[PDB]
Amino acid sequence: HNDYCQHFVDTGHRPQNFIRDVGLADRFEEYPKLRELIRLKDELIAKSNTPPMYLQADIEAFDIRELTPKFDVILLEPPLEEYYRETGITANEKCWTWDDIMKLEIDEIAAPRSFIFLWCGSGEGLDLGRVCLRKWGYRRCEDICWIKTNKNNPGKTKTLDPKAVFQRTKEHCLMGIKGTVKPSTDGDFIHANVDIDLIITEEPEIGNIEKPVEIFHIIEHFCLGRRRLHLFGRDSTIRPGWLTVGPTLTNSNYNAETYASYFSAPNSYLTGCTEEIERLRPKS
Amino acid sequence: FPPQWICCDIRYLDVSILGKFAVVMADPPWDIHMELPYGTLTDDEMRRLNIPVLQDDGFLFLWVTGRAMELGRECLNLWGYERVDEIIWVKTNQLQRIIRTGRTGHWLNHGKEHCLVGVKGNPQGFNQGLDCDVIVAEVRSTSHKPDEIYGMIERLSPGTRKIELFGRPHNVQPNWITLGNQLDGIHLLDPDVVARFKQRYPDG
């Protein structure tokens, strides 16, 4: 009956194992013009990217207002205890409760129109992350699911959360909007509908807490704002176009005046756009 | 018990005649604040549905989209449930690929539908962890949600009586009673339910 749910029960192959062409490269290999839109947009991002900037900070005991200027997009990846409970690993850093996360003053650094991308896990964070969005002044507007395949080690995985009824095989990155933005008329700030709300990759090795790098591509494609903050990033996530702030960073190079200067005159805080991308991107 | 169903308006049927169920499932026509080619129920109509009568201990499966991601959570709480899982249906085309193009969401494109899983009371006789929380299936005919959910629910709660609200004729299943305004008349087999039905609705 082509029932992949039954197939999982019988074999341990998760249903998502049978989705084809989920990689960054192979998805549009047969679609030259879909591929070209992505290639040109990635080139526009690269051409306009600030060099990587990063700051070691204990975010629990940090005045977040020290991060300037305001940010167009914020990616927030607090280390949840569930990441370590569900894998068995002992955390090497402070784990954050949702009370801890909610106390962050994200509204003090968000631009008046801006977006947030909050990694929420698979359990109570789907509910408490929404409360956090409210507290910070965002409206939940999409839910990007990271779906994990087990092609390399088929089998079952016990979810440790005693309230779970199903085996949990995904994580949710909630997207929030602040301010007024209209996809049809604010095309100098957002390119809507370039990516889908799904990321599909293989389960990471044990001990690896990293999130899929595709989340950066979705954010960068979607919002033309150049001021991008990654809170709780690490040495391994440092990336051009981003300011990375986190406790486990081994060095710091952030200078608030230098960083702000990249976006002030004669520069813009927006990437701009080419005529070629405007002709290719989805519009309604 | 073979399939049973009642063609009815969910807002107005006295569902106390139906007894208790181990699983409730609903795929409601939420008012998602946009023009739709079908009629919807208001938020207040959804809030007031008499879900609490249908269960003392068991599970609720509530499909949600759009602003109903939040309204559905409110309804779960208003009806007495705690949310303990969230299933997503990943929609694939005929060749097992996600359709990535078009404008299928307001900000990002949409590759999935969500179903909230709620628990009430202290159910027993259920099987945790047999299925994953990701369904992969093509969109079939008029289907708004995938038929794979019935098998997941049966493996979770085998042999128990279950009720579906806003169900369609395609959705009638053994062990389920299906309620909805497009079903073909009234067809009840459980002797305890037929007795309460004609007590409550003597003229039929």
Swiss-Prot record, chain A:
Protein name: N(6)-adenosine-methyltransferase non-catalytic subunit METTL14
Quaternary assembly: Heterodimer; heterodimerizes with METTL3 to form an antiparallel heterodimer that constitutes an active methyltransferase. Component of the WMM complex, a N6-methyltransferase complex composed of a catalytic subcomplex, named MAC, and of an associated subcomplex, named MACOM. The MAC subcomplex is composed of METTL3 and METTL14. The MACOM subcomplex is composed of WTAP, ZC3H13, CBLL1/HAKAI, VIRMA, and, in some cases of RBM15 (RBM15 or RBM15B).
GO biological process, one term: RNA methylation
Subcellular location as annotated: Nucleus
Statement: the UniProt record of this protein carries the keyword Ribonucleoprotein: no
Protein's job: The METTL3-METTL14 heterodimer forms a N6-methyltransferase complex that methylates adenosine residues at the N(6) position of some mRNAs and regulates the circadian clock, differentiation of embryonic stem cells and cortical neurogenesis. In the heterodimer formed with METTL3, METTL14 constitutes the RNA-binding scaffold that recognizes the substrate rather than the catalytic core. N6-methyladenosine (m6A), which takes place at the 5'-[AG]GAC-3' consensus sites of some mRNAs, plays a role in mRNA stability and processing.
Modified residues (Phosphoserine): 284
One GO CC annotation: nucleus
Stated family: Belongs to the MT-A70-like family.
Interaction with METTL3, annotated site positions: 31, 127, 130, 183, 284
GO molecular function, one term: mRNA m(6)A methyltransferase activity
Record note on what altering residue 140 to E does: Reduced RNA-binding
Biological source species: Homo sapiens (Human)
Residue numbers spanned by region Positively charged region required for RNA-binding: 130-139, 182-183
Keywords in alphabetical order: Differentiation, Nucleus, Phosphoprotein, RNA-binding, Spermatogenesis
Annotated S-S bridges: none
Region (Interaction with METTL3): 20-21, 122-123, 140-143, 163-172, 193-197
Curated annotation (Swiss-Prot), chain B:
Region (Interaction with METTL14), start-end ranges: 82-86, 96-112
Induction: Overexpressed in a number of cancer tissues, such as lung adenocarcinoma and colon adenocarcinoma.
Coiled-coil region list: none
Tissue: Widely expressed at low level. Expressed in spleen, thymus, prostate, testis, ovary, small intestine, colon and peripheral blood leukocytes.
Keywords: Acetylation, Biological rhythms, Cytoplasm, Differentiation, DNA damage, Immunity, Innate immunity, Isopeptide bond, Methyltransferase, Nucleus, Oogenesis, Phosphoprotein, RNA-binding, S-adenosyl-L-methionine, Spermatogenesis, Transferase, Ubl conjugation
Annotated phenotype, changing residue 109 to A: Decreased methyltransferase activity
Residue ranges, annotated region (Gate loop 2): 139-147
Localization terms from the record: Nucleus; Nucleus speckle; Cytoplasm
Changes after translation: Sumoylation inhibits the N6-adenosine-methyltransferase activity. Sumoylation does not affect subcellular location or interaction with METTL14. Desumoylated by SENP1.
Free-text function comment from the UniProt entry: The METTL3-METTL14 heterodimer forms a N6-methyltransferase complex that methylates adenosine residues at the N(6) position of some RNAs and regulates various processes such as the circadian clock, differentiation of embryonic and hematopoietic stem cells, cortical neurogenesis, response to DNA damage, differentiation of T-cells and primary miRNA processing. In the heterodimer formed with METTL14, METTL3 constitutes the catalytic core.
Family: Belongs to the MT-A70-like family.
UniProt-recorded name of the protein: N(6)-adenosine-methyltransferase catalytic subunit METTL3
Organism: Homo sapiens
Classification of source organism: Eukaryota, Metazoa, Chordata, Craniata, Vertebrata
